[model samples]
Target: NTIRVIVSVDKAKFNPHEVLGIGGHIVYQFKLIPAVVVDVPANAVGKLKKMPGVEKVEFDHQAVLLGKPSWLGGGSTQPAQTIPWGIERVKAPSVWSITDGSVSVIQVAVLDTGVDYDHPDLAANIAWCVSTLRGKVSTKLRDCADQNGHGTHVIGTIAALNNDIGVVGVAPGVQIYSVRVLDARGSGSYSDIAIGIEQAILGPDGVADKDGDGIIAGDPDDDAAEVISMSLGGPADDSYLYDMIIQAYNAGIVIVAASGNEGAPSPSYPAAYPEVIAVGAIDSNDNIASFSNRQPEVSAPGVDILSTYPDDSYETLMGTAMATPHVSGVVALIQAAYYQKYGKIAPVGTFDDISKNTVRGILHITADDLGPTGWDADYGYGVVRAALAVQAALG
Candidate 1:
């Protein structure tokens, strides 16, 4: 059987034979880095590992939200038509007079199994779609329709719609860039995931640095997504993915991720990364969810969150995975409000800057401090509020 492996090679002493010439087939040679995805049998590892060019051979791994979506005792009927409590708790509706996340202007790339782009509530908000599965084409519906309904639910909570047919999201009408990195079951490997981030940074124009100024995401014409919202986890200490995130953040994209749902002491990968905001889960009453991982940058409502489901229905799910999107939606509102007030897009600061001028900085100040007087390992800055954050963006 063929096994997927990511080979990290030294530019000076690398060749296709370390595994490729050893009866291995190359799946992808990353465009921006010195890495390659290969498929080879386990027995050949002896030769592959002994080569001088092989820095590391990281096997493919899964990125999970800790669990899957359940039917929630059968609430798939249409006409539920209600505003999720989290939206009101965060005060997203108060800022509707300003703008509901730039409509189709500022895009938030959702990296998950995929979304129900055709769902009436979500269809109007989806601006673009892409899949990063190993062999599947980026546009294929097979893996993009959200077979697990998890992606559909996540997007619904971020920007479902204000219509009478379904639940209204935090930043209702926020434009979504559905990037399908996970499969039907919601498992994704590292190679495809790197591509997903790359796609998010590239945006609709698919040109990271159209001017070739090497400025990439920050360039005005680059048209990259303003935000990236992910609800999955992978191993810690992954430099390959870490480097990509640094690039994305420096290019000005705000990244948000679930803090993990295993009730762990630390947040999960990507969220664990400094550039990414780790989101913990809170209930409607602002009580922390038992399943939310400890020590998040901020918390959001995640308990029994009611949102969209596949086949144009609705579902309720729980976990920090449910919390990540709320923060992302808040970011969307902030970005949109800044654009509305200042007539400028989301600002990307220096690569080392996570300062007061950045979106992450605003989030820290505007959070509804639910814990002690300040930042605590358990509650972080506090529960996030969209109206407060949007106010800061305009001010």
Candidate 2:
């Protein structure tokens, strides 16, 4: 098998012709950073790195979705719009009086296996869909459908319709953008994830082709999703991935990600990246799950959490990934409520976007502290309560 590498280059010196002259086939020329993703023979990487203009060449790393649901026995059945314990545990419904996420226009990109765009509980809120697998980067909605159900479940927890059936989401009905980076197996590559991040930054039209100035995030011309929620992570980290995260951050997109389920000492990449809000998992009894990763920025419900599945069905699962979206949905609420209150949009690029109380600061302030008096290894701050975070947003 060939090894994939990301060649971070000195853009001024990088010559595409010279690179192609070597043995590698270029997969992508990243718009957000000075790098390129390439596939080459196992022996070719060393020669490519020796070529001029290449700063550092790193292998395109691997990260799987941890596809196995922690607990799958509590199967889905027709429920009359019951709110799951995780949703209730976070007290997201407490803020429904102001906005159930539908009250304001907000878009969150779910980067994972593609979502079930046609699923009744999630259909009304899915705003955009795309697939980055195999590098075709297809725009067709069907092309991005969630063959693996994980994305559907994650999204259902984030934005499932607040309707009369199935289960309600933490922030019901924020605009959901499906960016499928992982293939049908719930596996993700560094390049696919970076591309997926770019797609979210550029939106549909920008991806197809660009006209005038470089269409960037928060530009009215650009339909950038306000927040990105990633439930995927790998053991390895690369400069290219960090560059992409930084690019998205500078463009003002809020990033939230899973702290891994290994029950390890540190959080996972994307989450470990300083820019993202790392989320840990807590059970219904308000105790941290042993399998949930440690050192989270905030914890949320992740055990036996019930949400949507493909083919208009439902399922229950657990993991730090399940906890990730709750914080993202809270971020969704914060941005939307800020707009509704201030009569203008606010970009969360800084987390310190506003002068008064930073979004993350408000999260820490409003969080129900646990473990230690301050932050702890097991539970970073504490459980994220949506109503409290939103209340802090307006003040």
Candidate 3:
């Protein structure tokens, strides 16, 4: 039987043709990371290790979708409610009112199994849709469709259209781009993830210098996403995966990921990565979910959360996955407000006038402290509050 493996190269500038020359079929070629995923003969693992420029080769472990049972009260519910309880709990309405006119200025990329762009609640806010299959990248006007229900639910929480719909997302007007990394089975390799991250930060063309100004965001040609929300993860800490994340962070993109649903004190990769803003789950009563992994930088409403599902329907699912988009959506609001006030993207200072660090800092300082105050491992800061975060950014 064939097995999936991630082959990390010794140098970032190595040739892909050389690696592909080896005995295996290439699945994906990482953009920023020096790695590739290959499906090869189970017995051929030894030959791959001895190849030139190969730093490390390990089996591409399986990572399942993380979430609990739906908390929705009934089945086949209509979109009568304008704002979801989770959105209300985080004070998103207040921020929405102030930044209503500028919500489209912010774009949050959901790197999951893809999104149901045709869903009534999500159609209006979908900006772009791109997918990666077996390492080949393809862009469609509206083809980032979802086979599984997880991606659609995540997108709904972040930017479901604000209309006469079932539920309004946290930042209902923000533009959302679906970057499909995982498959219908809710599993993917590090190479696919790396490519997705690169596409989010560098645009689908993988070019950061759109206007040739040397700075990614300084020119108007830069179409890189301002924020990225990831709801999938595994336990392994791949160095190549870490590099792509760091590259995206340096490019001024705010990365948000779920802390996993292990129900333990241990950390999950990607989310546990230092550069990522790890988010945990909390219930309506403000108590942490029993299954939510601890030590997240912040927590959000994840228990029985209602959001968009496939085929123009809604479903309530739970997990740190649900909590992640809440923070990502709030970040969209903060960025929109910052843009509305200053007429420019938020820059940290050194690389550009606006900064991801500044946006991240605003989120950290304005969060509602939940645990024992200060930065506790259980809850890094606390549950995120959208109004407070937006106010801090505006101030």
Candidate 4:
């Protein structure tokens, strides 16, 4: 297959060899810069009919990068609550008298900007962090690294190691796979996000090189990661991406996505995708986050969430981006507890089943419901209770 080249005039020209360095195969170039599409290569063209000092050179068929929507601060008053580890609190002396923290080994893939793997609180739990950028892709990765501070914060909420110093995660012992899908600016294309998802469900073995440089080369073990979390979204109605998500679910990978910060009742993609577990947000007092999109599969604490940030600083962020991890962590807890008891992963089920049965049980049973009765737009099934999820898994 021929490789596609994308270039920007304000930026440098596209070099086929540089791009190919990152495993791209360049079949040919084009006479016209920023060419639309053509069957023949640039060399085959007899004469360049179009004339002009070319400013950019982008390919017609290039893989697009995917990312989540930028964080739009949600709700007012009742600042978002910092995640207080539910499982840890419940396991403490008076609570259920729980033991055995090493019940399972489930990987939660955080598909966002790169995580702060060096954060003392988050370092221990980060199983692996890989950059899809290389050579020509190097610039792409650099732009995606924790610049916005959103991805890092989300990572902290999901798996900040219980190192005693920093804030606690909903599932402190679980491992995290930090996958970079969105760039630093917080905007990414669909393709990059899709590729990141595929990588997370699968592990780094086939994707990483022999020296462990990390290159995705298709392998069976890539299907090792159990849960995939995405905090980004955009306006699009594409079946290709949805199908990819469905495929992952069928492979036994549970996908958790943000319900979005739009604050409207309208549905959001991926989260709206039938096979995904959509998560909304709740505030400190346990009220539904006003800005949290309604119609989520469940709700979690998302307002004023404090987690690991870049440069060793911890700040609070709001929106479903923060709420999504609460559910993701709960999912990790259930998977871990199941593995601990059975010495195996949970059986695969449809997204609806996973939500109503596993995740739903945790959110519904232990949650201190607030809004209007059973399933309201605000709290959905109520705040996620990590402890309840573990108990249900054990039972």
- Each prediction's RMSD over C-alphas, in Å, is 2.7, 2.6, 3.4, 9.4
The order of the candidates by TM-score, greatest first, is 2, 1, 3, 4
Model 1, residue 300: what's the lDDT? Answer: 89
In TM-score terms, candidate 3 sits at 0.89
Q: Comparing 2 and 4 by lDDT, which wins?
A: 2
Span of 10 residues, lowest total lDDT, candidate 1? 347-356
Q: Scored by Cα lDDT, where does model 4 land?
A: 0.59
Q: What is the TM-score of each candidate against the true structure?
A: 0.91, 0.92, 0.89, 0.71
Off by over 4 Å in 3: 10-22, 42-44, 75-79, 100-105, 140-143, 217-219, 347-357
Pick the winner on TM-score between candidates 2 and 4.
2
- lDDT, candidate 1, at 118: 93
Question: Candidate 2: lDDT over CA atoms?
Answer: 0.81
Per-residue lDDT of 33-133 in model 4, one digit per residue for the tens? 22222222453232112213223343332221122332543221233333353323222212123422233356788888777767777788777775442
lDDT (10s digit) by residue, model 1, range 1-395: 87887777886787886566778987876656677778888888777777778888887777864434533434535565787778787789888888887544578889988888899988988888888888343676665678788888888888988877788888886888888888877788877887788788887776677787765533445668888999888765566677678778877788888899888998988888888999998887778888889989988888868888888888778888888998999988888877766656556433133354668777888888986787777778888888888777776
User: Which candidate gets the maximum lDDT versus the true structure?
Assistant: 2
lDDT of each residue in 1-395, candidate 2, tens digit only: 56777899998988877756766677888877899888777877778888889999888777777435655456556568878888887779888779877643468899999998999888989888999885558888778999899999999999998889988888896888899999888898878899999888878676422545543433445577778889988877788899999878876688999999898898888888888888899887888999888888889888888888899998887888789888888888877777678754455534223233556776777788887787788878789888888888888
Q: Count the backbone clashes (under 3 Å) in each candidate.
A: 0, 0, 7, 21
In the range 158-220, model 3's lDDT, one tens digit per residue, is 888777767888888888889988888788666677778878877755787766765553234
Cα RMSD for candidate 4? 9.4
